[PDB]
Design a protein around this ligand. Structure first.
Ligand SMILES: *CCC1=C(C)C(=O)N/C1=C\c1[nH]c(/C=C2\N=C(C[C@H]3NC(=O)C([C@H](*)C)=C3C)C(C)=C2CCC(=O)O)c(CCC(=O)O)c1C
Ligand SMILES: *CCC1=C(C)C(=O)N/C1=C\c1[nH]c(/C=C2\N=C(C[C@H]3NC(=O)C([C@H](*)C)=C3C)C(C)=C2CCC(=O)O)c(CCC(=O)O)c1C
Ligand SMILES: *[C@@H](C)C1=C(C)C(=O)N/C1=C\c1[nH]c(Cc2[nH]c(C[C@H]3NC(=O)C(C=C)=C3C)c(C)c2CCC(=O)O)c(CCC(=O)O)c1C
Ligand SMILES: *[C@@H](C)C1=C(C)C(=O)N/C1=C\c1[nH]c(Cc2[nH]c(C[C@H]3NC(=O)C(C=C)=C3C)c(C)c2CCC(=O)O)c(CCC(=O)O)c1C
Ligand SMILES: *[C@@H](C)[C@H]1/C(=C/C2=NC(=C\c3[nH]c(C[C@H]4NC(=O)C(C=C)=C4C)c(C)c3CCC(=O)O)/C(CCC(=O)O)=C2C)NC(=O)[C@@H]1C
Ligand SMILES: *[C@@H](C)[C@H]1/C(=C/C2=NC(=C\c3[nH]c(C[C@H]4NC(=O)C(C=C)=C4C)c(C)c3CCC(=O)O)/C(CCC(=O)O)=C2C)NC(=O)[C@@H]1C
Ligand SMILES: *[C@H](C)[C@H]1/C(=C/C2=NC(=C\c3[nH]c(C[C@H]4NC(=O)C(C=C)=C4C)c(C)c3CCC(=O)O)/C(CCC(=O)O)=C2C)NC(=O)[C@@H]1C
Ligand SMILES: *[C@H](C)[C@H]1/C(=C/c2[nH]c(/C=C3N=C(/C=C4\NC(=O)C(CC)=C4C)C(C)=C\3CCC(=O)O)c(CCC(=O)O)c2C)NC(=O)[C@@H]1C
Ligand SMILES: [Cl-]
Lengths: 161, 78, 63, 174
């Protein structure tokens, strides 16, 4: 594990834009990961229930478990892109060749696309969240640049897949 | 205590072209013919791997879901 | 199947945990009470999560 | 009867109520269609209800995942998440049937003594239950951020009061 605190953290927040808000946006994603993942995958399914019909993309416990895992993997590489301000790791370690893996496994591209579009809207919603301050975990304010940025990272995923 | 709990399932499936299996009683000749409640007793299980994910997810002690009361603390309260 | 697992610790005011993991220079500011942890581990496929999500799905199918 | 047979079978056999039997069931319970939607709001959100309730217990008292805390180990956290789901599911069945008998007899009977013998913190259970209650009521009354279940718009305050009572039986018992 790497630990970035104290002066290293202060420095990190000078080398990336929007440093404090950026840490907050990452915290909101990782602290809500299980719902982000389940809402995205189950929204793909509820809109296209044939995905859980016999022979559908996620119709068994095992298949669904793998899909939930992959959705989490993608979310986590997006979270690291937002932490670091760069999509290099996401592109090289998670998206490079993933479309071909999914072709070989018969994972449906339209299903993936919808999981991603729900996930993108959800994560952006955690960043653009306009709840009244007493119902908000961070100081209220403008996180538009981070919302745009993370939308770009999801768009890289969608393009690759 | 046996870890068993009732799983209730609510199928409101008007317009669904999927074969109907489960219900074996009379038809209503209305929309209820496309809706069903299922109940079964099953052991509820949670994996240690999911539990570990949850521990990590909760370890910020700060970020809630959207638009809910905030109750987090930095001191041990009990 | 590894991914970066990030934990963000805004620990301002938290005394019960001793801030011993980060070993670099301090600042004399509240940044000394905050830390980001990053670790690259295998992400598990959880069949209990799959089962509960499938049950959720079965009760909300659109048509 | 049909549901008590599967509740006592305790072996995965299922009961199915559709068609005319379901039309009849909705005549024999109060607000039958709205009641099914209320149940739906629990069972289609089960995983996030459990997670948010335990997560809020923990953010209010982070020492629960400090060493020796009530849910510090994967084993203990798994048991706690499990119990929260078990309780939520018995509440869902109480709402389906309009009665708390099974919740009281099969879930709550002996539960306090069990937790006392295991050292499970009563204050942690109290917070988890309060959040689960609020979350369920939020989904039932369209007070939630997400409104994924399509219902006709109306007043479900009676059903929200009823399910709140079932959670209050849990809180009382614990
Ligand atoms: C789960 C985490 C979460 C918390 C906590 C919270 O307060 N909001 C959260 C999630 C969230 N979801 C969305 C958007 C969508 N979610 C779905 C899936 C569900 N809709 C269904 O019909 C369905 C099956 C019955 C689901 C499961 C969908 C389809 C969307 C919309 C995606 C889109 O194209 O716009 C958001 C975004 C904000 C919003 O309110 O839509 C958030 C924050
Ligand atoms: C299941 C996830 C979800 C979606 C998706 C959605 O749209 N709503 C969802 C959950 C939900 N939660 C509540 C209420 C509360 N949740 C908490 C816990 C969080 N607060 C924290 O401080 C914290 C740690 C940092 C949490 C995690 C709390 C405290 C509440 C309020 C409970 C109370 O006493 O009233 C709701 C209900 C919202 C409402 O009142 O309408 C919902 C729907
Ligand atoms: C429409 C929603 C749909 C499409 C389109 C599709 O591809 N699959 C769809 C639905 C679907 N339904 C199930 C399982 C299931 N449905 C019911 C309700 C149904 N059964 C009845 O007897 C009646 C009405 C009287 C209705 C309505 C039940 C009870 C079940 C569960 C059966 C069981 O195993 O206990 C599924 C799941 C896949 C499968 O193979 O069952 C889908 C995808
Ligand atoms: C206060 C929120 C709190 C109470 C009250 C309590 O009982 N326990 C509390 C906090 C807590 N913190 C952790 C784990 C943890 N905190 C940090 C941040 C910290 N470490 C540093 O070096 C610095 C420097 C800037 C800060 C700030 C880290 C990195 C960790 C992770 C430790 C690890 O295993 O990698 C925990 C979890 C249990 C534990 O004490 O380890 C709690 C409950
Ligand atoms: C969109 C991302 C959010 C939003 C975030 C804001 N955060 C603001 C200030 C702020 N946040 C922190 C904590 C952060 N810094 C860290 O180093 C770490 C942990 C390593 C975290 C979690 C700090 C320290 C600050 C500065 C104020 C303070 O001392 O507490 C902020 C104010 C504007 C700004 O600082 O630029 C905002 C708007 N706010 C929202 O409404 C959405 C949901
Ligand atoms: C609080 C509960 C909700 C709310 C619920 C309402 N539902 C209403 C009518 C309704 N709901 C269903 C689906 C339901 N019945 C079933 O049998 C099953 C599954 C087996 C389900 C999930 C039906 C079929 C109906 C009848 C109308 C229709 O044909 O769709 C309703 C209208 C009043 C009433 O019928 O009593 C309400 C108010 N409404 C809300 O605003 C909150 C969120
Ligand atoms: C979660 C919000 C709590 C928490 C829960 C824990 N429960 C633990 C063990 C446990 N729970 C039960 C009751 C459960 N079994 C059933 O069959 C039914 C109803 C049909 C229920 C509600 C039992 C019998 C047991 C002991 C046997 C077992 O472990 O499965 C548990 C482990 C405690 C320990 O080993 O130290 C925990 C952690 N713990 C918390 O801190 C929050 C408040
Ligand atoms: C979920 C939204 C979609 C879905 C997913 C699904 N995936 C698999 C199996 C695999 N997924 C991977 C993914 C990766 N390999 C990588 O290198 C990376 C980057 C780090 C990723 C994300 C791999 C290797 C596998 C195969 C190994 C395994 O099974 O774990 C499955 C299972 C397919 C099967 O039947 O075995 C599924 C279901 N499927 C969908 O329908 C959703 C759209
Ligand atoms: Cl049929």
């Amino acid at each position: 594990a790497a630990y970035v605190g104290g002066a290293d953290l202060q420095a990190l927040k000078k080398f990336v834009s929007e440093g404090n808000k950026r840490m907050d946006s990452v915290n909101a994603i990782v602290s809500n990961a299980s719902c982000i993942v389940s809402d995205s995958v189950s929204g793909m399914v509820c809109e296209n229930p044939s995905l859980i019909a016999p022979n559908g993309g996620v119709y068994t416990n095992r298949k669904m478990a793998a899909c939930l895992r992959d959705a989490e993997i993608i979310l986590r590489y997006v979270s690291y892109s937002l932490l670091s301000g760069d999509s290099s790791v996401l592109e090289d370690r998670c998206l490079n060749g993933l479309k071909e893996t999914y072709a070989s496994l018969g994972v449906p591209a339209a299903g993936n696309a919808r999981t991603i579009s729900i996930m993108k809207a959800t994560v952006i919603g955690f960043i653009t969240n306009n709840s009244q301050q007493k119902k908000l975990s961070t100081p209220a304010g403008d996180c538009s640049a981070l919302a745009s940025e993370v939308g770009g990272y999801f768009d890289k995923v969608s393009s690759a897949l | 205590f046996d870890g068993l709990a009732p799983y209730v399932e609510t199928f409101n499936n008007r317009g669904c072209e999927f074969p109907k299996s489960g219900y074996e009683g009379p038809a209503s000749n209305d929309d209820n013919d496309e809706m069903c409640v299922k109940v079964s007793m099953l052991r509820v299980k949670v994996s240690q791997s999911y539990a570990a994910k949850q521990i990590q997810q909760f370890s910020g002690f700060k970020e809630s879901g959207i638009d809910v009361k905030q109750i987090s603390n930095v001191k041990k309260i009990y | 199947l590894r991914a970066p697992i990030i934990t963000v610790f805004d620990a301002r005011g938290c005394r019960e945990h001793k801030n011993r993991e980060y070993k670099g220079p301090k600042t004399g500011t509240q940044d000394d009470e905050m830390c980001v942890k990053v670790q690259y581990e295998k992400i598990a496929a959880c069949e209990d999560t799959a089962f509960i999500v499938l049950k959720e799905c079965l009760s909300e199918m659109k048509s």
